[PDB]
A paper describes a structure:
The bacterial chaperonin GroEL cooperates with its cofactor GroES in assisting the folding of roughly 10% of newly synthesized proteins, including proteins with α/β topology that fail to fold spontaneously. GroEL is a cylindrical complex of around 800 kDa containing two heptameric rings of 57 kDa subunits stacked back to back. The apical domains mediate substrate protein (SP) binding and the equatorial domains mediate ATP binding and hydrolysis. ATP-dependent binding of the lid-shaped GroES (a heptamer of 10 kDa subunits), capping the SP-containing ring (the cis-ring), results in the burial of hydrophobic surfaces on GroEL and displaces the bound protein into an enclosed chamber.
We performed a similar in vitro analysis on encapsulated MetK, by both cryo-EM and cryo-ET, for comparison with the in situ cryo-ET structures. Reference-free, two-dimensional classification demonstrated the presence of EL–ES2 as well as some EL–ES1 complexes. The latter exhibited subpopulations with wide and narrow trans-ring conformations resembling those observed in situ, with density for bound SP in the narrow state.
Residue numbers in the entry:
A (entry chain I), B (entry chain H), C (entry chain J): 2 to 526
D (entry chain G): 2 to 138
Write the structure that this text describes.
């Protein structure tokens, strides 16, 4: 199809307009006191929200080049959120600040390479200072405090998270489910987790979380590529009985069988979830065999000459609950008999004793840790049902926050860590008058989060920013109570990973947009 | 799809225009002497109404942003009506007054946060004063007078309501049905009510009330999630015989089964009503078993290994009449034999004697109260049929009014309670010159109901408002007779819940619109 | 359909506009530091790329004559890339330079014949000088260095390529496959390669490479033209069992059977790849028989009176892996037993001893070398999977580079060889004042690659070009480190075939455009 | 009459565009290998000239902000012709170069008055050096 092509400043102005529209819509919700955005709906009353993810989801522009700019910033913010677990609006704010200043500089006649170099060196220095500023969070008390803070001053949630990480290790697997009464019950079962997501996004039955959930499902353990429906039709017919879902774990499922399964799921004949087998090479079969032993199943591989046609319900495995994420699959409470679990664990342990390679033994300890660690289950108790659901959501968010906090520590919240590092780095210089303009652009953009937070609350950003810069350590401004104080003592924290990820991804997208020479899109016809 | 995005005053002006159109259309019907609105119809002659609910239902705007404003106000007015049982037009009037003044203030340069704070504190003070004014209505005589007033001076309606509440308790279940002759007959049967509405809005066969009604229906007591039609085809086939409706009470019905049932109901092959089982956790099965023993049925649960395929008409329960609301299900006159119900009551009573927790014994007290209280039935007698239907509607509205009156008491009607509180609070002050503008906005908007009532009747609002403010207590203006006097003695009352709900929801929507920074809607294409 | 016809300068201006748009979009990505081009996508976030092939693929123009110019340059650039393995962007840059200057000269009144003659003689002289500069690369050490350089300083890739070419000869067959662990394993099996591509482009299941890949496929060895499906239904029905793909190698497949096979592949019933038999005449049957012996099959020829209807799985051959390219078919690890292979080799060797013609014996040595050489397999080992895939792609590109390097040697990269030859040929003269304008146009366009590389890096092209011209030998500019030095020592090489092919194809397309008198296209309706 | 008001960078880019139009017309005639400019005259035949002030006195633009820029830069050539009788193309070239680099420095956040003071100091020192560098003729 015929294309529209733009070069140079003509492309830059369109990207700048799109970025400004997106960020202007999204940034008014930053902080604890964000303003309201009314999002229209096809039918009924609109949606009034203070969340930036929701606002960014429904932002689409009629002009194609401005739409390119908006989508470019949006997908980088999504990447930052995925990597860190939080920080979409902050990353968007940083990206807009850097992009606006840098594109103004480029339009004046400066060398884009020098600006990009200055921005990159400023960001690297800031990241080093951020590492210097961070304080470790590894002991139980700090973990509980971080959980309570992330649960909006809910001490029970932090208590449960601390108990779970003390039970199954801080690097283990934790899952939350619905409870029965008002009691928060925690228990340990046998399971494992491997990083393979669903093959198609059309299998998702929980759009609230964007994940696939199965209750007491059968699993097909095929060590081959699925190529024809005729191979799986008897298995599908057997699964249709008793009304139980089926989980497909095989080497790969290509177009025709994937389309058949997607159509079946949409019309609801049989609910099927498909996931690729973990790993590759000769270790993939070991991973699959460990899964089969955990779930008490049988591996169907062409090497043994086994056919999916002659497969009954016996060969399938059974698990209590299975959760499939975008890029992660969790198996919880397999029915595989436990003495067989001990026998397999002992066998691979003896293999470990025979390991002669560093990488090989590392993979073997990975396998034994996955197989013998188990998973932790936290059951949410409440009086009514809606509060139980929102409490479960709070527990999930607190788990995501606590994982990053344990990974890299915590820094003062409210946007004051970036102010600390920017005030530290005020002496940084570049080799060129254009690399100096880039260094000033990146350091000026670290005050944007706190300034926008104070602006949303309704005070004067300049006075509060000056007062915070004048202080030292964790001195900062509490937006909820409109008073100053030590941010740690007021319980306003951010994990270091969130801040670092947001800053780095904003700088990345800004550098990509600064050195862009052409944009090609379809005609507006 | 591409979106249109507006910021700031550009959004505020559009919301203001939409709110003005909606409220100007709806407020001319307020009071006993409202004017006429001519609503067009697809075919034939128009509809002429003095009711604001009907007028608000058919208001749409061609401009998208103004339509967002109108729908925003309409949805909050509907919330107020649902919470209090009455007060849609009053809530719309209060909301328009506050929104207009506050948006004018915001456009002039005042700070939205301070305005919202002033409005909120004025409303809280008004609510406290309204609680101060209210007088109790708990004894039988006051209940009878409130019922008579709510039934347009119909003493028989109040007599029946007072008898029913003295019979089955002021917090019991009361239902009204069609009678046989001219006699108003009241009787007590065995029944239960639980707060679970219909699964889909397409099951409603009575658009006049917006409720589902079933006569002698069978009930399916399934303690499992229903997902495949093949589980229920035999049961549906059995139900199709004898031409009796079926009510589904289960854990949940997912996409395809719900769609199949909706299609079957729409084409009328079998009339089916679907409703979710009450509660959750381990108590949900207790409630389901109590329902089963009430209606003489059998619980079909996968734990016992029972299948819906091998289910005949025997396992189903039978009830004389079942009514389903938007969020409430009522079962009247179950065929369950009384000795089984009494033995169940004794069993849970012995459980209560063994209760060791306050909230646990609270659930148990709720259960025994629901199971042993029963329901009251009021049968409407009249000479003709149209008169009987109109009297039944009057009885229903009187029941809704009397419930709120018992819950929170009564205050003088005609809009004079709000004048009383506004005149009381004339000394209230704020911390800022912008919080003072907010306080004056909220207190000035409390005279809007009485002024609009007097304007609709045809007098001068200012003279009557001044005369009423001059008085004290229950002194007020009768719009029907154009005469002053004591409101209580002339029988013009409002429940305190209606006034409080209208004021609070109006202030809520006004605060939402004041602090709105962006509006995103689809392109007009 | 009605056409639009343009003559002379009206056609030239449109072609010039199209060529300018294409080259302006594509050339900003040239070198190690090319800028970014944002390519819109139908859904989601755009594509940001620094690769000229991707940018050139998605360029279409709304104007039809300008689109002729763009497609004309694009197709010749693709030819150059196919012939040399690299040099699409460089060929585009050279073509644009020559075309622009030559068309400017033509529009002024100079004779197109003389301009074309001058350009042709300048290019021939440059090719001779480029042959003079080239340094041979045939010994193992130079091969290893060339492989390492082409693999981005990856010594293991070069080591593997050198080992493979030392095993199976520098003119042998090399194939890369996915490995198992982290070990790079190299082995030799029995196979052959013949230059026959897929019959239809719809059989390709690997759009990343644009090739057909089959795993353990059956092959149909038919020595006749296939035209009726009824001949080939039973064989496909047999093939559908066990879910194995089928490779069709016959004299030719006409419209009906090819369409049926394409439809079957598209809907995924049976995966079929079709290829024409190699050669022609009486040698074609000998080649087909050699393939059949290699794969342990049976030739189905009408001369023996064999029918495809009475063909079972026995007559088909089996191979471990088969790869089909655009114009090349590779058979790897046939199941043909080795003693039969040796007997066949001895038989054709005895035939060679009886050869009495030079060309005939040349065909016989071709046959024996292809039959007895075998193929080399290189297996890529890595830790993760994405790394393994990227490394395999790097190995493939290094193989393409090393083949050309062995074929013709290497010259200094960065565009300094063309500067060397242009500075050598500054004394060249033509017979006419119009042939002198053509000679200056061709020599001025040889500095365009280095100037564009330096422009993309951010320096001043004139100063760097002058410094490079002042030097001698392999002195040149390193764009990655912005430092001068000897190009060989910094490891910036470029095969002579790539440069020669790019220059020649650019001159060809320029000469075609210069002597073009008319352009016929469809109406814009 | 009614007026049009432009603030900041918009004004500066319009002004620089006008400066560039006039300077690009004038600068093609500089040196031993400069060329001629044909000037249309309402009364008579066109004049073919290689003089800087003759070309500069002729330029007027359609846009009014760009016309302001051109009208301001024209005074350099006018004054140079009035004072020395020669050297007007060189003056125009220098003025355009200074304006371009100064606007680049201003867009980087510098104070224009301090830049102006620095330019003045540099030019004063330069004139002293030029006086020191001459020889009698
Ligand atoms: N009470 C508070 N006072 C000041 N800043 C706060 C407070 N609570 C949270 N914050 C800060 O506000 C930010 C949260 O903004 P949010 O809307 O969550 O955007 P994001 O999704 O990008 O994190 C965090 O950086 C946090 O440090
Ligand atoms: N005879 C009367 N004189 C004065 N006011 C009255 C009289 N009867 C009812 N009202 C008042 O009119 C209001 C009823 O208006 P209505 O049209 O029902 O609006 P809504 O549905 O919002 O209550 C009540 O607040 C009531 O106090
Ligand atoms: N480090 C370097 N310094 C200078 N020139 C380089 C360097 N690396 C590669 N080149 C040159 O850049 C060219 C590669 O450009 P490329 O984007 O690959 O275009 P093409 O696809 O036409 O080869 C080669 O001619 C090579 O000689
Ligand atoms: F143009 Be100047 F007068 F030499
Ligand atoms: K928020
Ligand atoms: K009315
Ligand atoms: K490149
Ligand atoms: K001159
Ligand atoms: Mg957040
Ligand atoms: Mg009413
Ligand atoms: Mg290349
Ligand atoms: Mg002169």
């Amino acid at each position: 199809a015929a294309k529209d092509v733009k070069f140079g400043n003509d492309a830059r102005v369109k990207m700048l307009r799109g970025v400004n529209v997106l960020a202007d819509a999204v940034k008014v919700t930053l902080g604890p006191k964000g303003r309201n955005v009314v999002l229209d709906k096809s039918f009924g009353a609109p949606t009034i929200t203070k969340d930036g993810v929701s606002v960014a989801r429904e932002i689409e522009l009629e002009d194609k080049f401005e739409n390119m700019g908006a989508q470019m910033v949006k997908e980088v913010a999504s990447k930052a959120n995925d990597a860190a677990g939080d920080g979409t609006t902050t990353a968007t704010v940083l990206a807009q600040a850097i992009i606006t200043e840098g594109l103004k500089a480029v339009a004046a006649g400066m060398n884009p390479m020098d600006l990009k170099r200055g921005i990159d060196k400023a960001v690297t220095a800031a990241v080093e200072e951020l590492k210097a500023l961070s304080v470790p969070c590894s002991d139980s008390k700090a973990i509980a405090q971080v959980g309570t803070i992330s649960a909006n001053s809910d001490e029970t949630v932090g208590k449960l998270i601390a108990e779970a990480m003390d039970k199954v290790g801080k690097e283990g697997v934790i899952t939350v489910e619905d409870g029965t009464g008002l009691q928060d019950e925690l228990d340990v079962v046998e399971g494992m987790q491997f990083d393979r997501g669903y093959l198609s996004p059309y299998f998702i039955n929980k759009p609230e979380t964007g994940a696939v959930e199965l209750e007491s499902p059968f699993i097909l353990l095929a060590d081959k590529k699925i190529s024809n429906i005729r191979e799986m039709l008897p298995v599908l017919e057997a699964v249709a009985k008793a009304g139980k879902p089926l989980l497909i774990i095989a080497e790969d499922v290509e177009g025709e069988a994937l389309a058949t399964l997607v159509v079946n799921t949409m019309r609801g004949i049989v609910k099927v979830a498909a996931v690729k087998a973990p790993g590759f090479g000769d270790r993939r079969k070991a991973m699959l065999q460990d899964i089969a032993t955990l779930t008490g199943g049988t591996v169907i591989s062409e090497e043994i000459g086994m056919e999916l046609e002659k497969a009954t319900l016996e060969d399938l495995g059974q698990a209590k609950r299975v959760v499939i994420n975008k890029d992660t699959t969790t198996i919880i409470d397999g029915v595989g008999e436990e003495a067989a679990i001990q026998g397999r664990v002992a066998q691979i342990r003896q293999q470990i004793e025979e390991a002669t390679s560093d990488y090989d033994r590392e993979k073997l300890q990975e396998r034994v840790a996955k197989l013998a660690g188990g998973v932790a289950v936290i059951k949410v108790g409440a009086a009514t049902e809606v509060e139980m659901k929102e409490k479960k959501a709070r527990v999930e968010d607190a788990l995501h926050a606590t994982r990053a906090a344990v990974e890299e520590g915590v820094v003062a919240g409210g946007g004051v860590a970036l102010i600390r590092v920017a005030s530290k780095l005020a002496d940084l210089r570049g080799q060129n008058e254009d690399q100096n303009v880039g260094i000033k652009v990146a350091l000026r953009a670290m005050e944007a989060p706190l300034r926008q937070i104070v602006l949303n609350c309704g005070e004067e950003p300049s006075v509060v920013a000056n007062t915070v810069k004048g202080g030292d350590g964790n001195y900062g401004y509490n937006a909820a109570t409109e008073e100053y104080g030590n941010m740690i003592d007021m319980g306003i924290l951010d994990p270091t990973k969130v801040t670092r990820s947001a800053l780095q991804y904003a700088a990345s997208v800004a550098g990509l947009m600064i050195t862009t020479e052409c944009m090609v899109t379809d005609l507006p016809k």
